[PDB]
Amino acid sequence: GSSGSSGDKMDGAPSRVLHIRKLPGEVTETEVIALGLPFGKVTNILMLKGKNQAFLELATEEAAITMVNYYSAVTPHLRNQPIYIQYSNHKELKTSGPSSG
User: Fold this and answer.
1) Cβ atoms of residues 59 and 45 within 8 Å
2) What region, left, alpha or beta, does residue 79 occupy, with left being phi > 0 and alpha being psi -120 to 50 degrees?
3) How many domains does the chain have?
4) Domain range for 27
């Protein structure tokens, strides 16, 4: 069942950090790590326990740009369930920072 797809597809300022949604209920980092090792090494990872969301960060951005693509055509599934993978708005993986100083 060939299914097309219409998307902006505006690639200008790629982001090293990648956003992930619809994560397996009670998923273990390892899982998300095994899906990132292929492309590159995971230097930073954020797993939020609430809206089934998480942000992954590979050693370099290059590893990301290539990563997404792979999924852009291939639809992965964790624990017999579909997972969401797309770019992120935040340039850097927000982890620490002074509110005022």
Assistant:
1) no
2) left
3) 1
4) 1-101
Residue 9's CATH number: 3.30.70.330
Method of determination used here: NMR
Helices (H), 2-52: 29-34
CA distance 91 to 13: 9
Q: Please, what is the Cα angle at 22 between 65 and 80, to 5 degrees? A: 100
Which helix H or strand E contains 3, and what residues bound it? none
Separation between Cα atoms, residue 56 and residue 17, nearest integer Å: 6
* Whether 32 contacts 44, CB under 8 Å: no
Residue that is written with structure tokens 């797309």 in the block: 86
